């Protein structure tokens, strides 16, 4: 699986940033976070270095040569769908980064090093930024950096924007029910329903049903759905979901006809990272006084402030009679679920969430 | 669907 540490750092981030956010809706980039985080890597040497290889699971398994050719898979012109994968990094104008960083990251990231003023025009810089990734993002990103994310001595950010719109390989009807919140509250939500042949499965040691909604092309959605707690349902699953369980399932199904329910939905949120990573264990990226950036610069002066990260999505019906039992399967997603969408040629996982509250 | 990320690192002087 050539997207395996990937995939692993994605649920130990998701791990760790539940512990923030147990129960609410949550969403987020993994190929995204991976893509900045190899970026900044790049540029780290000793523990610092040492630290970041653990935490974003290269160990655990040619990493910036790898990035290349997924992002140039995941980029691939296809008809189907859009979807484009784009980093950049942005340097304070009057600082002299090392030439080797600059070249390899242009070389393996296609990040096109452009020079901004932040030493003294900090906040036309930030707007420039985040005008750029709401262009990358056809506007659904349009303030990554929020007030106070920049300043005179901020010397590099480093950025990537992800856009996805696809269709479904067969419409939803759009069809209000009741969704359960938690043991104390319901919410109604716009259902829709589809009947198709479709992939189901279960996974035992999640007590939770799998489902695969693909779109049309190698991209699809797949939906955990547990079938014991009074919050969200949703805790067993969290705690268990492991990249050996998940992907025994989505990488076991065998097709049959579903009955599908599920809510139209979007989501928006937005993430202050420095916390979770720290908490992961890559400590020494955002000491002031220990981070090691050599990489980036042979002074030795730069440390990582902060790593902001916003993700969005939309799920509606839009696709590219007479039944009238009801013996066989049915996926009613009227509860919590976690839901994520996989780039099927690479085994990416480009988007991950819990839709938990309407 | 339509979905969509960003993500920054910001690098600091010290």
């Not at chain 1, 950049?88 to 003023?117: H, M, N, T, W």
């Not at chain 1, 930030?126 to 506007?139: A, H, M, P």
């Not at chain 1, 007030?147 to 067969?170: C, H, I, P, Q």
């Not at chain 1, 997603?333 to 996982?349: E, G, R, S, W, Y």
């Amino acid at each position: 699986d050539l997207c395996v540490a990937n995939t692993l750092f994605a649920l130990n981030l998701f791990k760790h940033l539940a512990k923030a956010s147990p129960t609410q809706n949550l969403f987020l980039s993994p190929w995204s976070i991976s893509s900045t985080m190899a970026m900044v890597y790049m540029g780290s040497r000793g523990s610092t270095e040492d630290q970041m290889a653990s935490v974003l699971q290269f160990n655990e398994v040619k990493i910036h040569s790898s990035f290349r050719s997924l992002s140039s898979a995941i980029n691939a012109s296809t008809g189907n769908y859009l979807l484009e994968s784009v980093n950049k990094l942005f340097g304070e104008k009057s600082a002299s980064f090392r030439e080797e960083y600059i070249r390899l990251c242009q070389k393996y990231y296609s990040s096109e090093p452009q020079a901004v003023d932040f030493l003294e025009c900090a906040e036309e810089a930030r707007k420039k930024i985040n005008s750029w990734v709401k262009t990358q993002t056809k506007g659904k990103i349009p303030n990554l950096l929020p007030e106070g994310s920049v300043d005179g001595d901020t010397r590099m950010v480093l950025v990537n924007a992800v856009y996805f719109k696809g269709k479904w390989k067969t419409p939803f009807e759009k069809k209000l029910f009741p969704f359960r919140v938690n043991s104390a509250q319901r919410t109604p939500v716009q259902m829709m329903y589809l009947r198709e042949k479709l992939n189901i499965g279960y996974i035992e040691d999640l007590k939770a049903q799998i489902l695969e909604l693909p779109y049309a092309g190698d991209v699809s959605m797949f939906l955990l759905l547990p079938d014991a707690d009074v919050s969200t349902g949703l805790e067993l699953l969290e705690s268990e979901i492991t990249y050996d369980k998940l992907n025994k399932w989505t990488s076991k199904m065998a097709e049959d006809e579903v009955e599908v329910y599920i809510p139209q939905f979007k989501l928006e949120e937005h993430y202050e990272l420095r916390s979770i990573l720290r908490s992961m264990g890559m400590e020494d990226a955002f000491n002031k006084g220990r981070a090691n950036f050599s990489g980036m610069s042979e002074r030795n002066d730069l440390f990582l402030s902060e790593v902001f990260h916003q993700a969005m999505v939309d799920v509606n019906e839009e696709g590219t009679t007479g039944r009238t039992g009801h013996g066989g399967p049915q996926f009613v997603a009227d509860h919590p679920f976690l839901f994520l969408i996989m780039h099927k040629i690479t085994n990416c996982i480009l988007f991950f969430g819990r839709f938990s509250s309407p | 669907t339509e979905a969509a990320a960003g993500m920054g690192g910001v690098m600091t002087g010290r």
